Design a protein around this ligand. Structure first.
Ligand code: LX7
Ligand code: LX7
Ligand code: CA
Ligand code: CA
Lengths: 204, 204
């Protein structure tokens, strides 16, 4: 009776762990495929499932961090979004913090994604006329010639600057998409996806 | 490439169908066990998953209706809740509508649950001093001596009436709990629960 409820609670935690892993892989695929509405709906589902979990493995935690990074990148141009308690932190800044916090290899792609997020953290402020906010973002983030080039753009208020087109928002998105693809490779092995795929194939 | 994405979308629909069935059984168990917070968190998860589904089988639809009934019964005393577009409809009234709409057998238990919900739809208005609202609930719902007994209580404003203790809120809850148990029996066969349970047992 008391031990029966304990078995039930354990089974529900195993099932929730599977649902989280499936939702996390489905969210990454949507980001990669540009399916914004699916991303939005899958994120809501993943967040709710997390609220119903208590124990998280290191792999599940790292996986949750990846989904948060993607969510903030997707809201990168939404400066009215507050993802941190400090209301001064921009979405792209919050993503950078996560990117630097994820337990992952620091390969060339990692640094390129990092540097593109820093450039775009400033560019989205300039592109909304928020020149004082770009200066504040710049100080919280800041590569000496790279740093001095950005400050020069902020002070002159040149919003449509050529530098921001060479290291554009699309460029940042594509490199982030390349990373997700590598991740998606590793998560196509999840239990729920594998089982569902077999059913689909069984009916083909 | 185009057919690959189609297979992926099909597999995600099969996985979502499994997640819905698991969440629906977990929600019923919490209601039965009196775990209110788990019910609240599981309901949020189930609602999000539904927003990510397009096709629903008749069994999945009937199952969704059961969960909605339970949600409204749980908010039966929350008269500030609007579950219907008509803001005049009380939560218990909305549950009664669903109870009369579910494709299920109309056994003695079915009618008893129905009659107890009708009594309590009036009793929760009286118990908040909302005597005019009890009269409006009464007209939208209304067994001639049964009907005339309730109107007599409403007009005399007797809120703590003995009739409302014989056919009490707890009594309505217990009979609804008996039904869920029968339902829970049939849903313990779901794929996710079965698989998770095996894992738990494999580690016992
Ligand atoms: N507001 C935000 S960024 N919250 C959030 C939490 C968790 C999360 O991972 C996921 F649930 F999707 F797996 C994504 C976003
Ligand atoms: N507001 C309400 S009553 N909405 C709701 C929708 C669906 C539902 O079934 C479930 F998702 F839980 F399976 C429960 C409640
Ligand atoms: Ca702002
Ligand atoms: Ca009201």
């Amino acid at each position: 009776e008391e031990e029966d409820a304990g078995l039930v609670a354990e089974a529900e935690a195993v099932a929730a762990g599977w649902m989280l892993d499936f939702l996390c892989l489905s969210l990454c695929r949507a980001f990669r495929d540009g399916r914004s509405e699916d991303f939005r709906r899958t994120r809501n589902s993943a967040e709710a499932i997390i609220h119903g979990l208590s124990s998280l493995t290191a792999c599940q935690l790292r996986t949750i961090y990846i989904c948060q990074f993607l969510t903030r990148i997707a809201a990168g141009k939404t400066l009215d979004a507050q993802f941190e308690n400090d209301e001064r932190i921009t979405p792209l800044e919050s993503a950078l913090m996560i990117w630097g916090s994820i337990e992952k290899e620091h390969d060339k792609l990692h640094e390129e994604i990092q540097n593109l997020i820093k450039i775009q953290a400033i560019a989205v402020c300039m592109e909304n006329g928020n020149f004082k906010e770009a200066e504040e973002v710049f100080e919280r983030i800041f590569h000496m010639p790279f740093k001095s080039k950005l400050l020069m753009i902020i002070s002159q208020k040149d919003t449509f600057h050529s530098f921001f087109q060479h290291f554009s928002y699309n460029h940042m998105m594509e490199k982030i998409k390349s990373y997700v693809n590598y991740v998606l490779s590793e998560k196509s092995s999840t239990f729920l996806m594998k089982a569902a795929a077999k059913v689909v194939e069984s009916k083909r």
